[PDB]
Design a protein around this ligand. Structure first.
Ligand SMILES: Nc1nc2c(ncn2[C@@H]2O[C@H](COP(=O)(O)CP(=O)(O)OP(=O)(O)O)[C@@H](O)[C@H]2O)c(=O)[nH]1
Ligand SMILES: [Mg+2]
Ligand SMILES: [Mg+2]
Ligand SMILES: [Mg+2]
Ligand SMILES: [Zn+2]
Ligand SMILES: [Zn+2]
Lengths: 260, 1361
DNA sequence: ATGGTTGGGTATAATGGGAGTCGTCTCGGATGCAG
DNA sequence: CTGCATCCGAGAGCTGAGGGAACCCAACCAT
């Protein structure tokens, strides 16, 4: 019942893995479904993405909640098309189903990759979900014509999504991605300098070890903006009666003396 | 501005929440990392919540007032006060609905009760573990049709929604016994190692080779995973056509000639349950479409569907396959729960439950009633059930979840910000995933995470593992955590606050102070009265302006002399409040006039230390300053120390002489006894005088002259008046303790000069000689009890002002005479009697005997142990008696003896430990040792004896430590249950009363023995006589308040057999709503006069009960017994009582024992354990509710048997027993008030012509009013039974949701009140305190608070007008 | 017109987690046993 | 079919004082 990680693992494990034939088959289906989408777009003259959405809505079914009226009108706006040039629509439906299967089958690689990113400010399930987003992107961009295995192309996208989510969401005060990379590089450099020197390095040593464009003052500013806020509810003392925010005075509202 | 009169709480609709919000929070950003300004659309956005600066937009275009209500075009920030940042709310629009955990996890669940779903089913559906069916659409599961409100697992839903399509991996290089496209029954083997299990068609998957004929001869083509087969099985081919397409153009397989095609070595076989339809032209339904029987598929309608299923058009074989499925509509989570909630029709459900409530089954009726409670609450409040599912989540204003820069430049934030950030991140990710057409597993996981995030925001640490911040184990503080607990909003910021104009300091004895005065340090007073001092400095020439006065007062070295005189003028006539924690009763806060002193210590009067429970070993006290005229008047009239002289709990004096004062008065009022003469015989006084001059007889020896006892002092020294006797004392002729003859008040008194001096002290204090002579007891030494009686009599006869004068005089003279008396403690003052040695040897004798009796088989282990214990107990008692006999006979002025006898300090047990012996000690297991400590504290203990006593010392310390907490909790519960009870009217008009008995049955059932005087006083003093009483030719009229003299007269009449019980009014029989009346309460015990209308007697009762319990009552027995009685707990040592009347017939077998109660109608039986002890005998008569065994009686069984009155009397008597055992004086009224609140409710047995339900608990007053109206209309009255519940359950069942929520169980109270839409009418004190209003008690009572005052001149002018 | 910020991309193969906690008492739903 | 009977889980245990872990590349709004 509880422990949602076990529930999610059970639901992913209920889906069997894939062999080479099945994986290549599904990838080829996805590619031809996209080509069929574009062919049908050219035939009807309409926007390809909207017809893609109609195919996705029809596959997902009524169960999944663009409205039913519009998609129904375009659905019968496509059934009117004659044979020989109609196959495209069936191929698009099949390809979308293949995309769903492929994602469902490759969900476990996301967990395998994400299990080694815990302890960076994001919970395990959040990392898993962001890895799933990266997996969807990799599925969309995968090219089976190169005869590479799917996981080889999927791992890069999963890692990129997880890293981007960590850089974006780990801090209460959002710090841009380039600045986050700068902070990580600074910390790693400081750790290497401490390992070499046998003691905590000074800011000038870190500035020298970063390279051109770095002085001790800039390192000081970077460490200043990398400080994370503390909780107003941090317990002070042994008894559970004193919090940190109990020691912080209000400096905004005017005092009775000031008002007088 | 209209006055606030009621507060209502109710569920909030999504429309209401969206109307609250000033904008949607779309981003989890808080502030920018460079500029430390709020981020747009974030949790701190000025566009949503308001500007940080007053009258200034974000971009600075407008920075001035008059632009109120104007929104800047560039930045979107309104121009207004910044304080709106603590009022303006936001909201989050959830992608999917989420359930409010309060209505899910508070047992029993409101949503589960409404939808008839168990907790397990609700948890399974809400957190995406099982589906729930809506509109099954004619689906079949395992041969049984599916119905609404049915729970399907993931497997059952997947089978029903899609179908069965199993795949079997054919081993490499093995062909299958079956062909592609052939129906396969269950069990039919498809390979040498594969056996099918489901029915339907088999389909080849990835054939490893293709055999293509050529017009004939065959040929083989290998099929690798990286290539696919295009031509369907059993289809001819042409020259040049391709069959097995490959990725590489050179790898493609083009057919050389015309030939048939076959596919072999399939990688796997897919067995499905489906129907098949070939076609030869354009088809109509594409892949992923669901069809019904008889629908057009292809061939212009030539083929038609025969079954329900989903259509997939496989172009490889040019065949339409309908996989057996349904369009069933089963959903998961809060969306499904909300859909079920909106379809609910409450009136039809109410009718169904009313029909169900007619079942003979009691359990069914109880379940229907429980569901009906919720249904009717929703119907009455007008709330919609679907509002229990959230669509928009409100967002607290930022100023109540601040992100602030600490003085050190770092940032500090609230946990609510992190919870909101998690919620927003998960919602945004869910929206993105939905916009991407993600598979259903990912969407289900994301929705589960969103539900968990909402739960964590509302109530963290309730379902599952609590959310914590990384790197710590500390749970994040949710809104529920903020609301509830000892540190929550209610108990920490609403029922108690930190205040201005207050200080604290160590306390020092103030012996030169008057009763109404306290010593206040100069610096403390200057800080406390600073604005008044500034005004006074402005009035004088000390400062040109208030700012200059403040600057001058800022620095210590800048203060002069005249400011102190200005301060002395400021405080003239004003009072301050002194308070010592813990405040156990109202006397813990008292008003005093401050006298400015030097130093840093508060000076306290010695006579209020007992009321404060204050000593001078480091105690600290707090000082508060009442500001306005009303506050000062209340402090001076009601809370002045000199106006509070009697205890509100018992009516006995509370400010009284103690310690050194008692010692001095006793020393001067005790008389010498001498043995030199020892009853000699004399014929004439001259012979006695000559004998005394010769040295043969002492001055105070009891001699006999002329047949009358006297002494030489009485004959030798005869004084004309007290002045002559005291002048002789001043000359050393006689001592204060010598017995002489003095002429006073026209009489010749054989007394001592000290007693005459005490009489003069009293007479000069009260400024009345005859009354003072009447008050004092001349012929006894003045000790604690006599002094207390004198103070009480002086109060009654003269008033509190003269009583205060007398108290001050007694204090002064007691201190003066204690200083010069010569009281000291030396080691030789702990006199060891000689008898002890003998008493020890005697004991050492019998012990040997005991050992003999154990070596010869005559004694067991238990018998010998008990005999030794008894012997040592009796030896200890003998040693105590010997010690005190030695003190009485030989050293009557011994310091320890005088200290114990006067009541100044010490009790006989401690003195025995000092002098005689410590005695027996208890092991940590609770059993006694066999050897006692035979050494006293003067002799010195050995190491082993000291270690043995350490067990008891430690146990006593731990006892104290737990007891104080348990008593505090009990006192809080009592305050919560009685806080609304006020004296609200003069007379309720009732004719009911209670009968206080004067005789109690004996423990040996011999006869009725007269009760102790203290118990009768505690039960009778101050009460109003309900009926006229004639005793000893004295007529006590109806409506008379019983004074102490009347109580004594009643006791005297009872001792003469004229009366057996007294009928009096009581709170148990009062008819006043939310309180009592003046007559049913009686005296205000702190004033010895009828109670004033408006007195908060409930608080007084709770404090009176709770104060002694702290420490006084030891810890079935002690404080646990009192707690068990006030909570109405069923005893674990429960006794057996008779439910009906009848005669007793004990039926005993050698294996079992039983008691039959045989009435004239029926004969009942009671089986009890044989080892028990019976209070009844064969052939006896027992009434209903009488006990048959020893032990504590269950109050609920007594309520069923005898009724309400008997249970009230039992509870009162049993609670008073514990307090009497400890020696605590406490009036019955307070316990009666608490018990009256305990018995406040009834249960409906038959509704009659009412809308009530059977078994519905409701207030007794409300049902009586309902019955009165029903009788007025002429209907069938409601039938009810009384109920009894403990203080906790009675307090939690009140009408006011504010007090119940601030008491305990906050989430349950709040959710029930919100469901019901309850309105709080602000009747009690706690609600008005929470709202910061004027409490309906004391000066805030409607009886007195509209009084006007005017002079005669102004009144006449208005009269002329 | 410059820096700071943001969106997109990487191709051998990779396929179900991990810390933890056992020394408290009392009272009201509830599943299980019998009749 | 009812009833009682252990069984589990949920909500409590005085106040006051003092206590503080990848890197790179290119287009694009803001200032
Ligand atoms: N609210 C609390 N007050 C306490 C606590 N411990 C001590 N105190 C207070 O401090 C006081 C300490 O009392 P002592 O142990 O000195 C004994 P007391 O003066 O009452 O008696 P004698 O020794 O007979 O003179 C106690 O009466 C309370 O007023 C506690 O845990 N809670
Ligand atoms: Mg003391
Ligand atoms: Mg003390
Ligand atoms: Mg004389
Ligand atoms: Zn602006
Ligand atoms: Zn009354």
């Amino acid at each position: 019942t509880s422990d949602p990680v076990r529930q999610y693992l059970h639901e992913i494990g209920q889906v069997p893995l894939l062999t080479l034939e099945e994986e290549v088959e599904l990838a080829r289906k996805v590619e031809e479904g996209m080509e069929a989408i574009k062919k049908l777009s050219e035939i009807t003259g309409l926007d390809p993405d909207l017809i893609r959405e109609v195919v996705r809505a029809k596959i997902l079914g009524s169960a999944r909640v663009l409205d039913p009226k519009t998609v129904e009108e375009i659905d019968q706006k496509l059934k009117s098309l004659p044979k020989e040039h109609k196959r495209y629509l069936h191929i698009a439906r099949e390809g979308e189903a293949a995309r769903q299967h492929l994602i469902e089958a490759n969900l476990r690689l996301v967990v395998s990759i994400a299990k080694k990113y815990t302890g960076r400010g994001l919970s395990f399930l959040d990392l898993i979900q962001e890895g799933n987003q990266g997996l969807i992107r990799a599925v969309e961009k995968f090219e089976y014509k190169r005869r590479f295995k799917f996981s080889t192309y999927a791992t890069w996208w999963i890692r990129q999504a997880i890293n981007r989510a960590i850089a974006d969401q780990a801090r209460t005060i959002r710090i841009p991605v380039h600045m986050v990379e700068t902070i990580n590089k600074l910390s790693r450099t400081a750790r290497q300098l401490q390992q070499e020197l046998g003691r905590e390095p000074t800011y000038e040593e870190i500035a020298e070890a970063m390279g051109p464009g770095w002085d001790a003052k800039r390192v000081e500013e970077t460490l200043k903006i990398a400080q994370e806020p503390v909780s107003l509810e941090t317990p002070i003392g042994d008894e559970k009666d004193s919090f940190y925010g109990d020691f912080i005075p209000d400096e905004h509202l005017p005092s009775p003396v000031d008002a007088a | 501005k209209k006055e606030v009169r009621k507060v209502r709480i109710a569920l909030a609709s999504p429309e209401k929440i969206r109307s609250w919000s000033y904008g949607e929070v779309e981003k989890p950003e808080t502030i920018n990392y460079r500029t430390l300004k709020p981020e747009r659309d974030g949790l701190f956005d000025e566009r949503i919540f308001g500007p940080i600066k007053d009258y200034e937009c974000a971009c600075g275009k407008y920075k001035r007032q008059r632009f109120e209500g104007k929104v800047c075009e560039r930045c979107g920030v309104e121009v207004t006060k910044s304080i709106v940042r603590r009022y303006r709310m936001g909201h989050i629009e959830l992608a999917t609905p989420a359930a409010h955990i309060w209505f899910v996890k508070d047992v029993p669940s409101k949503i589960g009760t409404l939808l008839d779903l168990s907790a397990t089913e609700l948890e399974q559906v809400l957190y995406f573990s099982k589906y729930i069916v809506l509109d099954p659409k004619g689906a079949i599961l395992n041969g049984v049709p599916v119905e609404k409100r049915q729970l399907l697992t993931d497997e059952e839903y997947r089978e029903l929604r899609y179908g069965k399509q199993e795949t079997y991996p054919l081993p490499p290089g093995v062909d299958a016994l079956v062909k592609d496209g052939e129906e396969v029954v269950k069990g039919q083997e498809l390979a040498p190692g594969v056996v099918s299990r489901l029915d339907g068609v088999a389909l080849y998957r990835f054939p490893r080779r293709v055999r293509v004929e050529y017009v004939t001869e065959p040929k083989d083509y290998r099929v690798q995973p990286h290539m696919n087969v295009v031509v369907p099985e059993g289809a001819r081919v042409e020259a040049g056509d391709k069959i097995v397409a490959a990725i590489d153009p050179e790898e493609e397989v083009i057919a050389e000639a015309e030939g048939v095609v076959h596919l072999h070595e399939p990688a796997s076989i897919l067995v499905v349950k489906a129907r098949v339809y070939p076609f030869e032209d354009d088809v109509e339904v594409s892949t992923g479409d669901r069809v019904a029987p008889g629908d057009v598929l292809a061939d212009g309608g030539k083929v038609k569907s025969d079954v329900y299923g989903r259509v997939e058009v496989d172009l490889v074989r040019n065949v339409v396959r309908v996989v057996e499925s349904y369009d069933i509509d089963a959903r998961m989570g809060a969306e499904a729960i909300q859909q079920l909630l909106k379809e609910l029709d409450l009136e039809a459900l109410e009718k169904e439950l009313l029909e169900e409530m007619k079942h003979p089954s009691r359990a069914r009726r109880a379940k229907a009633r429980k569901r009906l409670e919720v249904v009717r609450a929703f119907l009455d409040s007008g709330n919609r059930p679907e509002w229990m599912i959230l669509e928009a989540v409100p967002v607290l204003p930022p100023d109540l979840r601040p992100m602030v820069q600490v003085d050190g430049g770092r940032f500090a934030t609230s946990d609510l910000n992190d919870l909101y950030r998690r919620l927003i991140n998960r919602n945004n990710r869910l929206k993105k995933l939905l916009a991407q057409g993600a598979p259903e597993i990912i969407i289900r996981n994301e929705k589960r995470m969103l539900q968990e995030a909402v739960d964590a925001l509302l109530d963290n640490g309730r379902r599952g593992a609590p959310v914590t911040n990384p790197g710590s184990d500390r749970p994040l503080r949710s809104l529920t955590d903020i609301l509830s607990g000892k540190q929550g909003r209610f108990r920490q910021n609403l029922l108690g606050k930190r205040v201005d104009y207050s200080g604290r300091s160590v306390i020092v004895v103030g012996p030169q102070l008057k009763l109404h005065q306290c010593g206040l340090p100069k610096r403390m007073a200057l800080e406390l009265f600073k604005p008044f001092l500034l005004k006074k400095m402005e009035e004088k020439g000390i400062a040109p302006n208030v700012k200059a006065a403040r600057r001058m007062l800022e620095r210590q070295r800048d203060i002069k002399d005249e400011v102190w005189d200005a301060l002395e003028e400021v405080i003239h006539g004003k009072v301050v409040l002194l308070n010592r924690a813990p405040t156990l009763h109202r006397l813990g806060i008292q008003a005093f006039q401050p006298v400015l002193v030097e130093g840093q210590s508060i000076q306290l009067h010695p006579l209020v230390c007992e009321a404060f429970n204050a000593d001078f070993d480091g105690d600290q006290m707090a000082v508060h300053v009442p500001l306005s005229s009303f506050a000062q008047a209340e402090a001076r009239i009601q809370m002045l120390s000199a106006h509070n002289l009697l205890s509100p709990a018992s009516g006995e004096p509370l400010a009284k002489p103690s310690r050194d004062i008692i010692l001095g008065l006793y020393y001067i009022t005790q008389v010498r006894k001498e043995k030199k003469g020892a009853g000699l015989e004399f014929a004439t006084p001259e012979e006695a005088l000559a004998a005394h001059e010769r040295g043969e007889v002492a001055l105070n020896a009891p001699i006999k002259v002329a047949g009358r006892e006297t002494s030489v002092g009485r004959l030798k020294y005869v004084f004309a008046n007290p002045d002559e006797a005291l002048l002789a004392v001043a000359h050393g002729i006689v001592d204060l303790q010598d017995v002489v003859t003095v002429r006073y008040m026209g009489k010749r008194l054989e007394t001592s000069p000290g007693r005459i001096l005490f009489a003069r002290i009293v007479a000069e204090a009260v400024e009345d000689e005859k009354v003072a002579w009447e008050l004092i007891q001349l012929d006894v030494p003045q000790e604690k009890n006599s002094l207390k009686d004198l103070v009480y009599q002086a109060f009654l006869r003269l008033g509190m002002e003269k009583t205060a004068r007398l108290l001050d005089a007694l204090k002064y003279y007691g201190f003066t005479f204690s200083t010069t008396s010569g009281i000291t403690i030396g080691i030789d003052d702990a006199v060891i009697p000689e008898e002890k040695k003998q008493y020890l040897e005697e004991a050492d004798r019998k012990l040997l005997q005991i050992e003999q009796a154990y070596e010869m088989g005559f004694l067991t282990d238990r018998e010998r142990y008990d005999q030794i214990l008894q012997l040592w107990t009796e030896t200890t008692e003998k040693v105590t008696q010997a010690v005190f006999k030695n003190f009485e006979e030989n050293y009557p002025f011994n310091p320890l003896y005088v200290m114990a006898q006067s009541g100044a300090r010490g009790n006989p047990q401690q003195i025995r430990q000092l002098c005689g012996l410590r005695g027996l000690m208890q092991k940590p297991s609770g059993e006694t040792f066999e050897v006692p400590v035979r050494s006293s504290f003067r002799e010195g203990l050995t190491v082993l004896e000291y270690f043995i006593s350490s067990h008891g010392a430690r146990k006593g310390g731990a006892d104290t430590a737990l007891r104080t907490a348990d008593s505090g909790y009990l006192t809080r519960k009592l305050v919560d249950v009685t806080h609304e009870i006020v004296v609200r009217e003069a007379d309720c008009g009732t004719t009911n009363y209670i009968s206080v008995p004067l005789f109690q049955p004996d423990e040996v059932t011999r006869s009725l023995r007269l009760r102790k005087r203290a118990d009768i006083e505690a039960g009778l003093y101050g009460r109003v006589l309900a009926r006229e009483v004639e005793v000893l030719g004295v007529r006590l009229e109806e409506g008379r308040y019983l004074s102490m003299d009347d109580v004594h007269l009643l006791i005297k009449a009872a001792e003469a057999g004229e009366i057996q019980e007294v009928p009096v009014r009581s709170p148990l029989t009062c008819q006043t709503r939310y309180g009592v009346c003046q007559k049913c309460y009686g005296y205000d015990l702190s004033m010895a006069r009828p109670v004033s209308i408006g007195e908060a007697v409930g608080i007084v009762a709770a404090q009176s009960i709770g104060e002694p319990g702290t420490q006084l009552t030891m810890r079935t027995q002690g404080l646990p017994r009192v707690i068990e009685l006030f909570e109405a707990r069923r005893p674990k040592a429960k006794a057996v009582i008779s439910e009906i009347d009848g005669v007793v017939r004990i039926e005993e077998t050698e294996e079992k024992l039983s008691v039959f109660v045989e009435s004239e109608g029926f004969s009942k039986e009671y089986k009890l354990p044989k080892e028990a002890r019976l209070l009844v005998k064969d052939g006896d008569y027992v009434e209903a509710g009488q006990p048959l065994t020893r032990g504590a009686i269950d109050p609920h069984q007594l309520l069923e048997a005898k009724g309400p009155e008997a249970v009230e009397r039992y509870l009162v008597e049993e609670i008073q027993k514990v307090y009497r055992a400890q020696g605590v004086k406490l009036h019955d009224k307070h316990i009666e008030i608490v018990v009256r609140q305990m018995m406040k409710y009834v249960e409906v047995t038959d509704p009659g012509d009412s809308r009530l339900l059977e078994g519905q608990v409701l207030e007794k007053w409300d049902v009586e009013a309902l019955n009165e109206r029903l009788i007025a209309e002429g209907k069938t009255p409601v039938a009810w039974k009384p109920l009894l519940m403990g203080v906790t359950k009675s307090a939690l069942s009140t009408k006011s949701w504010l007090s119940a929520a601030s008491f305990q169980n906050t989430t349950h109270v709040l959710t029930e009140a919100a469901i019901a839409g309850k309105k709080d009418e602000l009747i009690g004190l706690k609600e008005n305190v929470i709202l910061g209003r004027l409490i309906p008690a004391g000066t805030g009572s409607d009886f007195v608070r509209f009084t006007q005052v005017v002079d005669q001149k102004t009144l006449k002018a208005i009269e002329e007008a």
